[PDB]
């Protein structure tokens, strides 16, 4: 029996890991893990596929979050129960700012809370802010590989106007950040987020790959 | 469109099916489909696995929704554009009422909308109500196999933990507006918590689609006695039989 | 002195009744009662006119509710204090769906909560749903007399856009259902609602009469 | 229109009256009207009973509103289309302040909007305020007959039970947001609860009409001693005298 | 050390005063004080400048409030701690009603609560109403000098549509009244407000001067 | 415009400065400016006092905001129309976390929006976030002089009393929605309360301006020991040094 309700993991599986890289789906999980040492698939239940690997001799976790705040909230809480204290989200997004180019990397400082799940953790007035160390590490890792990076606000909703968030400067949209960032910032957990710009309605697997290297390199600076 | 991104289906694959049984977990799709005739796998992507089968000669679909409102809305919407007009949610759940026993079956008339996704289809004031024909079919099917059935309100929350006022967690605490909410729902007659019915019921009720929901009770946190871990798998099979018999009546 | 603040009734008046038919005004109260056996006028205070009658040898109550949630909340609570556990609302409405015809009967499964009173009983997230047995009994009674019936959502507000609720499928509008349904569904009381379609902006006393027979026949199935 | 559906009146019946005294209960209309000159009954439908009378030679109207905001809004609106520009609400109420005694009179300056109807005339941020000339007239009239008067805020709730945090009920419970609300209103200086002033004051304040409100205190749930059941009927007569004398000054 | 966190005053400074005239800025404070007897400047810290004076032999306070609800809330609470029980606000505003003329005087009966601070004292449903005595005294003082006066609703926000509040009859806009009135009416403190109409987008220092005399004369009737 | 009403400045006075240090109190402007080169006073009206100075050869501005969001929004907006694109808020604050000591320095990453003014620039869902370059500069400057720094969330309230759940007041009470709020913010990791950052951060984050915030801790209401009343003035100087060094890096 695992120590958690959904992930199907026990504390021993993590072998002392305190950091987890949290992408959306299993395919990406394996990709991330494959960049690191001693990659081992630990469990797979529903949307939650967890691998374990090592960075500079220290164990790190990679675990899929599924779609939306709801599913993210489960993986995040269960990983925290298992000992994870630092969470780094990696994804691919579409930018909505004309000065942002495909291939560029977006580091979220905070999210527009347009979801439902974030509210189960804090009133709307509480900001969905990324941890400073985590954001720093991500910005430095991106710089380390010559990526063009934008650091700012991301809009996060439960749905899969554009003009208003664009005037407010929001760089892009996605569905899980408000939850991740809020639940971490309101519980003493550190979270950060990086996304590769694969489209801009205002070349593509390379971007994802470059985003994957960047989350891994940020992790190395955070352990 | 004639195909859909997430499910990976074309309309032709459905052979004109207009009813779908929607469990949450893709691993339970094949088993529900196997209960009917000519079961065949159509696709499988992410947590969206769908099979087709025949019931009384009519094509029927079984497709998993994954966890949560957002994931569920993507499934329903795609199935809807593929021709599905009737959705039967089948699940396993915990109960929050003392008089409800593991092995009992819950049929949901409407849900408390503690989610985000449902709000994109209708404002909060709109009820996350289940279609009467669907509810009727599900209740009569449960009565057919002699199940003990509870018909009422379900609370649909975007979280498994704080929204269901669980304190067995990393923080050990729950945000203000949720503190004491479980007791309120209980005193108000809510049968159980789950996470997808708010978006499913609201989407369908607001878009002229029929949706209904049944679930077997596998645990009860208000009861001291723990499930028979026997009676649990029996309950899941039980629920599956119910939802299939209900589809039979909605063809 | 009555046992209640407004209805002017004592528990004995109900003679053990546990079901009440709740129309809006006194004129309709007498009409309903007159369909049943041993009809007796019990009290009349302000908007609240209560008769007692018998259905298949069992006593039933008929009591006017007045206008809106506020007044309904009073009659409903006081009837509950007196022992009523099942409430059936009967009214006449205007439909807003093109496929609904005058003369048709509308059975509400749940209401759009646009009132104020419903909130004094439960947060807006709680659904204003009709009890399943009550809805069933109403649908069966309508069928028993060959009525064309529609079963769905009703919009309920305190005011005496149309296009939006029409696209959401709401069948019609009225002012008391959100309160009735919410206060009953959140307190273990059973409620159901039926209305005769007397207009459709998208023959008339017969409709009301047919709605009256239907609520009475549903009551018979619920006792 | 030249007639109105609910009240059953034509403009001519009012003989150019522009002031109306609006009690809640139709059975108290005749008695208020009888205090003035040439009292005549005009109509009576549902809980809407109206009489006309003369005060200092000017036609004045008395019309009941029935119970609740929705019923009240129908009365005010119709009277307004018939030419009424000044409304004086007269009532009997309970108090929630210990220093307020049965037999005392309350004149309302503004109301806490715990209702639904008022929101159709102005957003919550708008104050349910009473017209200054009306309030002035009512306060000076109370002082004229030597009443003990309290001038302040009234809480106007859509329910008699949970909204006034009554626990003497079928359920014995009150929804979250209302739990402890009575104590808050008290500490904030609210004098009493009633059910119609929010819609009356907001309608009038937002539509350039004058409205004012007076009520006699017939009970006090914070006091142990029960009313003299003598002093109660005296209080109602008392209030009636006040509202009539106030109309006298607003002609 | 003062008895309060911001005003820099001790209870003795007030010499028993229980009434305070509360304008927005220090310049106006001196003007008001100068109308009275024995005017003495007591303190000046940040936005808060307090003078003490006498009206008909009784001590009265004049204290600037600064800009907005936030700053007003501080002066109001601290003055209350020091013993003030009656607060009279004086300002100059722009009217938005065509029938209101420059030079006219506006006495607020209640405010549209469009600010943030008022909510820290009471839920939005609670009315931001002026005390009856205070409003009376102000109306009588205005009448005493032949001023054309309007008594009604004022819109109060944190920002430095017009058409909607105009149809609702609101006479004008300002930023501090919702806070003043709400915090006083919800704590047993008496508050009133008068403003001189210096503009009407629908001669000028005289108006202010006439508004100043009026607040002072109202104070005299309230002590 | 080429001038601004409230600050009393023309664009030329700023000599092309695009960065401003914004303390709250005008009496602290000269001292911050004196730390840099060629300090000169430009204006002084109400609580809006501004000086100009040079840092590493570049003109820089120092301007006080006064107390509260509304007053702050007027300052920022005017400075913005005069060419300022980078704002560094410098202040003194109390802490609400036991592990935070007087003399420590707080650098704010984002604020809980408990105010009214911020809402005019963006809806509540928008985060009152600080610009990353500004935050970075402030954190590295604090590390430069060896300060003990805390980087996190600040609660920005429209009141000093009820919004910071102070019970040491005239009423001795706090409105419902604020009762127990202090403990929630604490458990959620909020470092301190202040009153202007919500509007400053939201304005800038939503308008493509950079803003950052640092403050020295001069008190701690969760600690029994009272400040050294020595270490307090040292803390203010400390914070001033930090914000100046941070500007140095943002030129």
Curated annotation (Swiss-Prot), chains B, D, F:
It holds the Pfam family PNP_UDP_1. Its main location: cytoplasm. One of its GO terms (molecular function) is potassium ion binding. One of its GO terms (cellular component) is cytosol. It is found in: Cytoplasm. Its EC number is 2.4.2.3. SUPFAM superfamilies: Purine and uridine phosphorylases (SSF53167). Gene3D superfamilies: Nucleoside phosphorylase domain. PROSITE patterns: PNP_UDP_1. InterPro entries: Nucleoside_phosphorylase_CS, Nucleoside_phosphorylase_d, Nucleoside_phosphorylase_sf, Uridine_phosphorylase. Pathway: Pyrimidine metabolism; UMP biosynthesis via salvage pathway; uracil from uridine (phosphorylase route): step 1/1. Optimum pH is 7.3. One of its GO terms (biological process) is UMP salvage. Keywords: Cytoplasm, Glycosyltransferase, Transferase. It catalyses: uridine + phosphate = alpha-D-ribose 1-phosphate + uracil. Homohexamer. Belongs to the PNP/UDP phosphorylase family. Catalyzes the reversible phosphorylytic cleavage of uridine to uracil and ribose-1-phosphate. Shows weak activity towards deoxyuridine and thymidine. The produced molecules are then utilized as carbon and energy sources or in the rescue of pyrimidine bases for nucleotide synthesis. This is Uridine phosphorylase. It comes from Escherichia coli (strain K12). The gene is udp.
């Amino acid at each position: 029996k695992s120590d958690v309700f959904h992930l199907g993991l026990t504390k021993n599986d993590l072998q002392g890991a305190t950091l987890a890289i949290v992408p959306g789906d299993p395919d990406r999980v394996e990709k991330i893990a494959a960049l690191m040492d001693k990659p081992v698939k630990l469990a797979s239940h529903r949307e939650f596929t967890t691998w374990r690997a090592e960075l500079d001799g220290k164990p790190v976790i990679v675990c899929s979050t599924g779609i939306g705040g709801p599913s993210t909230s489960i993986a995040v809480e269960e990983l925290a129960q298992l000992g994870i204290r630092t969470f780094l989200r990696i994804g691919t997004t579409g930018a909505i700012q004309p000065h942002i180019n495909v291939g560029d990397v977006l580091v979220t400082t905070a999210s527009v809370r347009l979801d439902g799940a974030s509210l189960h953790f804090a009133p709307l007035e509480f900001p969905a802010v990324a941890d400073f160390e985590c954001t720093t590490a991500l910005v430095e890792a991106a710089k380390s590989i010559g990526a063009t990076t934008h650091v700012g606000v991301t809009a996060s909703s439960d749905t899969f106007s554009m003009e208003e968030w664009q005037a407010m400067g929001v760089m892009n949209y996605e569905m899980e950040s408000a939850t991740l960032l809020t639940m971490c910032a309101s519980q003493g957990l550190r979270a950060g987020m990086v996304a590769g710009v694969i489209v801009n309605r205002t070349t593509m697997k390379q971007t994802e790959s470059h985003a994957v290297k960047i989350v891994v390199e940020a992790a190395r600076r955070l352990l």
